[PDB]
Amino acid sequence: LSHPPIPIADMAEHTERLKANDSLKLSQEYESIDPGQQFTWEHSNLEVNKPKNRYANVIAYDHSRVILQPIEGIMGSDYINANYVDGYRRQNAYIATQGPLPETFGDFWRMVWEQRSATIVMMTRLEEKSRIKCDQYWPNRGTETYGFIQVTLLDTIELATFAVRTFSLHKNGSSEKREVRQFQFTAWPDHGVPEYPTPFLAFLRRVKTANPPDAGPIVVHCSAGVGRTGAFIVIDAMLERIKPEKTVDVYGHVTLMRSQRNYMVQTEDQYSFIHEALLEAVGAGNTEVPARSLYAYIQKLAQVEPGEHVTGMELEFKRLAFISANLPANKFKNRLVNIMPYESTRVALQPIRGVEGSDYINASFIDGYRQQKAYIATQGPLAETTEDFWRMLWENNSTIVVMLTKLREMGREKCHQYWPAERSARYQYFVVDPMAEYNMPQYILREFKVTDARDGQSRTVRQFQFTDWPEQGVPKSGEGFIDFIGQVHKTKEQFGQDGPISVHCSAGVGRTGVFITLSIVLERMRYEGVVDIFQTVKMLRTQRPAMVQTEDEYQFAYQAALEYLGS
Template identity: 50%
Template sequence: QQRVMLLSRSPSGPKKYFPIPVENLEEEIRMRSADEGKLFREEFNSLTPGYVQGAFEMANKEENREKNRYPNILPYDHSRVILTQIDGVPSSDYINASYIDGYKEKNKFIAAQGPKQETVNDFWRMIWEQKSAIIVMLTNLKERKEEKCYQYWPDQGCWTYGNVRVSVEDCIVLVDYTIRKFCVQSLHDGCKAPRLVTQLHFTSWPDFGVPFTPIGMLKFLKKVKTLNPVHAGPIVVHCSAGVGRTGTFIVIDAIIDMMHEEQKVDVFEFVSRIRNQRPQMVQTDMQYSFIYQALLEYYLYGDTELDVSSLEKHLQTSHNAAPNLVKIGLEEEFKKLTNVRIMKENMRTGNLPANMKKARVIQIIPYDFNRVILSMKRGQEYTDYINASFIDGYRQKDYFIATQGPLPHTVEDFWRMVWEWKCHTIVMLTEVQEREQ
């Protein structure tokens, strides 16, 4: 069995971290991010791994060991989800899943490992018994050629998992996540009406590290909140082990609620608290710092999504907004965009002297993480570079290539790009000459 790599903690004693008022958040993050995130690492390493008195008796029972995806990621006895016992099947009340509190709501979430083939029936039994209406999935089925989670739903039609029948109602694929709607019926409780269960599957978490930007995660989180019915059971959140990405998601959700209620942020205290409900929640310092980045993004820009029905009203209030009104005018909205930090440290390739000559406007350089890479010409350095970036569409990753108008000495690279990336459409939004330039 694989084990999850757990980071060693610093030997120094526990240090106290205090809540941060939201207006100081940007400055605090700037300080913690200095020296490649040295202070973030220190803060993360000061967390205790989990509940000192926590026992794992049920998880360690011989008949339950096979049900655990990783032998070192187990639920505590005091906070584990208990299934109804199946007659004649010892320990059939066990699943590797734990109740986790939200900001103020007790047992708002269930943090679970990604189902294994042997535990799929238990997983659906849990969904039914807990009356959960939302499943949040934060891993892909395979990453780096390793199985991270067994596919626990049918692609189409209907499938029966133990005593629970699951049929696919709908599937919507968007750029960062996929929404699947299932009709779920218990064959055991035949008299009970079928239920709608929605799975929101975040597909943009990279195999290594964390997403480059928290924007996709924040939109995803909003969708989860919107789709969860008021009287439903706990939201089931899982990745592979059910601690790293799962913990990250739960913490962002809780601290956003805290920001609204108290105008402050206390990530350290909340992570410490939920580690008493499931060990190792939030696994790496990168995930820990990503939580802060997401909170800052939310604080600076808020929720900018509009319902189509309110678009006209938004435009009118934006145009008519007097400076003293709370409503932000379009100019204010645009001004916020100009504050988005340009990350010069992530433009190393474009800033090489040989590549600077290929820039039409010296300030507009592609980021390394999404630049278009050409095939390298044999024996010629830097020939894999063009000033062009992949841009996501609404439903599809890298749907567009945004590029500068070719220069005389980059025309050949431009056509190489069109050929190598199989582009069938070029949209040109300038004249060859404008204002005699």
């Protein structure tokens, strides 16, 4: 009645309608959400329970609350601020709860134990822009006791946009030991919702694969346990829904959620984000592959299926498809009009008083496998942006430069020679001294001393220039490129860089993208034994446009991933 399901085919259009005229119908739809019934919240309001509430205004409805076994002689001991929430035809599939307080750490663990949960989803950083969102309810290492549950940290994996912690739980008296994994999403912005859903969707895939299909409810929490917690739940429930059903009903599911916990999906932006994520999720399907299945996967990609006129490989690639960059005074600072950094990931320079746009360089921060901003992807310097380049490196503590083009190819200038060789150069406040030049079969290593003139300080800069990329196409073997990636990264650890690796070719998307793609993929193969090239590329394209420009480029990443598996 009045807000019917949306077939996954119309999801595109529907979303754009809601978003029309600065999200006017989204807003009217959202404001109309109403479970339309009266709840009570007596337990949350017990005097003894009020300090167990992180926010006095975010309570637990009586009828859907999670009820803990009482502790003999302790009034109020059945209470936690938490409610069951439904998934798609999955009753009480989730527990939505606040981020635990020091005084409720024991309650939270006892909840996990008694509810037989195997998975915790933490939708927040402990602190975000100074403000504490959640206190740390788990041990730094080893075993800690909370109430009567002993929680042991077995393992910590920590990656660019989330962390996974593995725990063992043991209540005293029983030999029972239970395993629980906490997935912590670390990339939700301090303000608003994520610009793109791709990190969250990969986060969600992790969670779902780890969660055993016979456990109790997934425990989900942010700060209040309503806002991001809500988005996680709806997105998941709708991805479940579309397996047997091929329609989406966000409106309907948020409505059901509101009858279970106050405020689920707390902002319009969150409501919008849910639609964007679900939109992107129907877009790709599963592209992740176990190492053992890689070759077969590749072989399958290599065929022209009955029905299609192109390869599966090229069909997969097809599915992958600017304020400052435009300011008139920065327009000469771009090699190509149509290759610009996004505002949100652009690498801004320290502004220089009295020259507008001297905060601009065509460059973009890019996350790695383990850490965010592990790369800057930028174009080959122009004679006119050379100075800017050197300052970007200094200001951003980048001391490794990967150049993926010859200065000239196919009788065109690809890159200006932005480095000195015969003698020292001064590029503005920076003195760069050429220290050595190593000619390897497939690349050249150049080493520079860079001295800040202003304060006499100094850093070593190393530049790796790969010289074996064919001027048309892509390498026939990934061997040399693999070794190259290896060398750049050895050199990173060996001389303890914290800073990003700055990577460029000519426009700084194609080969640049392949380099960054493989740097991520090959480490993920080492540590997970899975590969997902498509999602890696998809991700890069959330931070810089057109990363991995061509089909052959895309295919090469597969090729190199394959050969690397070979060793």
